[PDB]
């Protein structure tokens, strides 16, 4: 689908939600452990092209928050469903 440009704020520059979505996608997909260091995960996504789509500072920011939520999720009983 994805028919009809939602409303790209820019002309030829993907929106924040767009680029941000990409990075987050690989972050979870690649399997970026939460209880790990930015160094390890970094190299794990360093050879990735999408990694050059977002700023250097953001990458870390979005990563930190992503890990926080990934860790807290534990508090919950679990993904188990009856």
Swiss-Prot record:
Tissue specificity of this protein: Detected in brain neurons.
Domain FF: 16-69
Induction field: Up-regulated in brain tissue from patients with Huntington disease.
Annotated compartments: Nucleus
Origin: domain of life: Eukaryota
Comment field on protein domains: The FF domains bind the phosphorylated C-terminus of the largest subunit of RNA polymerase II, probably mediate interaction with HTATSF1 and preferentially bind peptides with the consensus sequence [DE](2-5)-[FWY]-[DE](2-5).
Subunit structure: Binds formin. Interacts (via the second WW domain) with TREX1 (via proline-rich region). Binds RNA polymerase II, HD and SF1.
Role this protein plays: Transcription factor that binds RNA polymerase II and inhibits the elongation of transcripts from target promoters. Regulates transcription elongation in a TATA box-dependent manner. Necessary for TAT-dependent activation of the human immunodeficiency virus type 1 (HIV-1) promoter.
Protein name, entry field: Transcription elongation regulator 1
Organism: Homo sapiens (Human)
Lineage summary: Eukaryota, Metazoa, Chordata, Craniata, Vertebrata
Parent-protein start and end of this portion: 651 to 719 of 1098
């Amino acid at each position: 689908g994805s028919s009809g440009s939602s409303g790209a704020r820019e002309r030829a520059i993907v929106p924040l939600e767009a680029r941000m979505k990409q990075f987050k996608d690989m972050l979870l997909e690649r399997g970026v452990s939460a209880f790990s260091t930015w160094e390890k995960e970094l190299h794990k996504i360093v050879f990735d092209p999408r990694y050059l789509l977002l700023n250097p500072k953001e990458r870390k920011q979005v990563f930190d928050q992503y890990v926080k939520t990934r860790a807290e999720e534990e508090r919950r009983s679990g993904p188990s469903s009856g």
